[PDB]
Design an enzyme around this catalytic site. Structure first.
Site, PDB file in Angstrom:
ATOM      1  N   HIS A  82      13.053 -40.982   6.068  1.00  0.00           N
ATOM      2  CA  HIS A  82      12.229 -42.146   6.355  1.00  0.00           C
ATOM      3  C   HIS A  82      12.917 -43.234   5.548  1.00  0.00           C
ATOM      4  O   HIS A  82      13.644 -42.935   4.601  1.00  0.00           O
ATOM      5  CB  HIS A  82      10.803 -41.964   5.824  1.00  0.00           C
ATOM      6  CG  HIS A  82       9.961 -41.029   6.633  1.00  0.00           C
ATOM      7  ND1 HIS A  82       9.637 -41.272   7.950  1.00  0.00           N
ATOM      8  CD2 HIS A  82       9.348 -39.868   6.303  1.00  0.00           C
ATOM      9  CE1 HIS A  82       8.859 -40.301   8.396  1.00  0.00           C
ATOM     10  NE2 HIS A  82       8.669 -39.437   7.415  1.00  0.00           N
ATOM     11  N   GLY A  83      12.698 -44.489   5.911  1.00  0.00           N
ATOM     12  CA  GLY A  83      13.318 -45.560   5.160  1.00  0.00           C
ATOM     13  C   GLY A  83      12.834 -46.928   5.570  1.00  0.00           C
ATOM     14  O   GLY A  83      12.015 -47.066   6.478  1.00  0.00           O
ATOM     15  N   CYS A 142      14.498 -45.982   9.307  1.00  0.00           N
ATOM     16  CA  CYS A 142      13.970 -47.287   9.689  1.00  0.00           C
ATOM     17  C   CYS A 142      14.539 -48.376   8.787  1.00  0.00           C
ATOM     18  O   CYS A 142      14.884 -48.124   7.631  1.00  0.00           O
ATOM     19  CB  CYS A 142      12.435 -47.297   9.591  1.00  0.00           C
ATOM     20  SG  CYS A 142      11.606 -46.409  10.939  1.00  0.00           S
ATOM     21  N   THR A 174       4.889 -38.436   6.627  1.00  0.00           N
ATOM     22  CA  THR A 174       4.819 -37.343   7.592  1.00  0.00           C
ATOM     23  C   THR A 174       6.153 -36.624   7.709  1.00  0.00           C
ATOM     24  O   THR A 174       7.197 -37.159   7.330  1.00  0.00           O
ATOM     25  CB  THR A 174       4.428 -37.852   8.991  1.00  0.00           C
ATOM     26  OG1 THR A 174       5.343 -38.875   9.398  1.00  0.00           O
ATOM     27  CG2 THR A 174       3.014 -38.404   8.983  1.00  0.00           C
ATOM     28  N   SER A 175       6.115 -35.405   8.235  1.00  0.00           N
ATOM     29  CA  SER A 175       7.328 -34.619   8.412  1.00  0.00           C
ATOM     30  C   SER A 175       8.157 -35.226   9.539  1.00  0.00           C
ATOM     31  O   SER A 175       7.617 -35.838  10.466  1.00  0.00           O
ATOM     32  CB  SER A 175       6.972 -33.173   8.749  1.00  0.00           C
ATOM     33  OG  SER A 175       6.201 -33.115   9.934  1.00  0.00           O
TER      34      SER A 175
END
Lengths: 147, 103, 103, 147, 147, 103, 103, 147
Positions: free
Chosen positions: A93-94, A135, A34-35
């Site tokens: 993101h991660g 994350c 997701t954005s």
């Protein structure tokens, strides 16, 4: 001369150094990611903050895993002799040890290795800072009331 | 005293030395981001740098960031699972000297 | 300004807050110990505490420990694989205030 | 009264707190783990160092995984109201996130959870320090010469 | 009687056993997980397939991590004495060793432990099958042309 | 011959024995699902069970499933990263006997 | 029927196809070895191959190995922690056809 | 000709193929790894067993991580056109996904990649078997009595 201690990094080189900001907001539909609404606010805030610290800020938006690696490799091959330090901010993101490009993951170790003391000689002995907003797992902190 | 592992003629440093990783959250945890104001970590980091970069050593600045994120933020979510959660940034230093942005 | 995740009526803190982990080595690496003098990390930690506990904030003491271990120690081994290696301690702080052992 | 900042932990309680040292030197033959020569020097050094900081030092040698958990549980259930902090030093073989008892591994998380802000109320808001001498993997740092 | 080999499981009990199908298609917005279009086709196909094998098929849709654990616990506590085996099909998002409920992850080990030989005695010595449609990582197989 | 670890008076079996995990993909890999026809694995598993459950031992049925998924399917995606990819199911057996759905 | 991911003009196979890993133990578990007779797994594997290689398909041979190890072996150790333990081998197949050592 | 099914690998090539046995019994003192008594019995048993299956057995004892990789690389570069399959037996200390050379670990993936369908063309479409005697973790199976 008088007593010399050397307890703090030499930060009076001609340049403070580069501040590379990788801002990944939009991801390829193929990833199902997701954005990241609000990340542009972070990127702008960082640009202004580090600008005032006299860093050469370079921003990049929505980079693929390939572009991230290429960017880091290229930057690590520049001559940092007249720069006091190096800063890299990763917004994406991660998961633990991983940062996501717009089309897939990139091991943080692959990114940081380019700057190892033996691989980027013009930065040897100089502080290399990696600021990471991502994350590192799926645990949630319920917190605790304070007295 | 004398030993086999100290005072080498040729001075070397670890290839992993002089790196500092300022993580937004603790190992194994989610990291929080406000869809309008940005991530709790970056918001706080910029605020602390703007206020203390010409006054405090970097580790102390980051410590202020840890406190700001830990005390001032708490998640809001329509999903009970992700509601009322907390976050503590994680400073990982392999630096060998103090770092001041000013001189 | 106002929002859904700040300034709660009931004050709470993360259950993971106020912890500090002083690791002898970086994540994913071996940690070194001298069979006669003890571990590089503990040797250095005790030396820095003995010298700075009544003078410096804890994070700064641990930073001195990082430098001492990183610069003064290098492994010695008859096995080439484990010979001439280095180590950098790893400070992991989720503390919310400065810590001085004295008052 | 005058301006109050509260930027440092209150360390003037009647007691500085406990300093639990778990010193594992000898491991059960069944584990195939080797002895950790030199660890006794560490344990003694720590006892003296923290003694001078006014901590109540308690040492334990060669504890099994069960004894480690029992020790931590018991200590976490003590009334720490009059103590400023808590210190635990772990000296043993280990891997990332794990510390070894004399007969097997113990998740570091299991040990630290006993002291969570919601599980040990008399330590809520107080610094909880875990000093760990143990491996966190099998990587070796070749180091880099300094100029 | 004649020579007895016992090389195959006894599958002639009064009942073939249960076939629990957990079909997670819709996930809570809070997780940021996308819907799994096409999973209903899988659930229906499985129901028909195992129905014809004479299994007692029970389907559950969009279960939270709590409901998954409760379901598995409850099922494991049933008397399986007259059943030949046990089958559980998990359809959801996942990672190595993890299956996702609609509001978060569930360790596969937590689910399977309920059926361990010492925890579900009426299934001891009987085949316990877990069919899992879910990711086990982020690697992609580029494949290779065949000659 | 004789030894310390065999022929126990009291017969026991591992608590982990008699489990079979039929994974849709290899360890560490993504698993594929067609938004219209369902997952490649379940589609194939049901087809092979429907055709061979009254004829072949379970492991052999699952082997047919492995071949069907491995040979007949290849991903299609507008994202080049996820396009033209393959999948091989993964049979993990800790079963102690052959399994036939019929008798 | 027709689709975007099947019946490709150019036939290809996964680069990970046609591999079989015969593990001595289940994922995450220790593997046992007798200091005199060898490992439980290899002892059993050789015995089953010697007896069934000219009679059974490989997966079925390995299944016999699983049963032999699971039922006939139990650890003996002076350390209670490692005493009376069990083991179940783990067959991981990404093979696409049956395998017979004979023809 | 008549109906052709192709359900089994073609195992009638001129050669059955290689059977590489890596037998690590003694490890460098530097690793702290103990010797694996009894492994020679395994290596001999394997040599005889595969000899009778007509495999070209090649044994290697106490190889370092470098030698293991070199051995695997070299073997993968041989012309396997006239061989029906490939077998590799690894006997050593290990952990999940890792096998130990006499001086350190080797990722199993690094070893197996040399034989990928696109990297070893003379083995494409042929069975590649890896038999592994090594630990995959530190869990212990208490087992369960059977009725």
């Amino acid at each position: 001369s008088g007593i010399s201690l050397d307890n703090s990094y030499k930060m009076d080189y001609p340049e403070m150094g580069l501040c590379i900001i990788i801002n990944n907001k939009n991801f390829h539909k193929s990833t199902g990611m997701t954005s990241r609404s609000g990340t542009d606010v972070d990127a702008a805030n960082l640009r202004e903050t580090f600008r005032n610290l006299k860093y050469e800020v370079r921003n990049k938006n929505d980079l693929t895993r390939e572009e991230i690696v290429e960017l880091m490799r290229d930057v690590s091959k520049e001559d940092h002799s007249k720069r006091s330090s190096f800063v890299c901010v990763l917004l994406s993101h991660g998961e633990e040890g991983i940062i996501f490009g717009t089309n897939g993951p990139v091991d943080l170790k692959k990114i940081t290795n380019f700057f190892r003391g033996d691989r980027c000689r013009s930065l040897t002995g100089k502080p290399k800072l990696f600021i990471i907003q991502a994350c590192r797992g799926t645990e949630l902190d319920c917190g605790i009331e304070t007295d | 005293a004398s030993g086999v592992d100290d005072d080498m003629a040729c001075h070397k440093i670890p290839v992993e030395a002089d790196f500092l990783y300022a993580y937004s959250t603790a190992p194994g945890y989610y990291s929080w981001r406000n869809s309008k104001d940005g991530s709790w970590f970056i918001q706080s980091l910029c605020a602390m740098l703007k206020q203390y970069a010409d006054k405090l050593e970097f580790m102390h600045i980051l410590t202020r960031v840890n406190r700001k994120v830990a005390t001032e933020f708490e998640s809001f979510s329509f999903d009970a699972t992700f509601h009322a959660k907390k976050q503590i940034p994680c400073i990982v230093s392999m630096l060998t000297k103090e770092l001041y942005f000013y001189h």
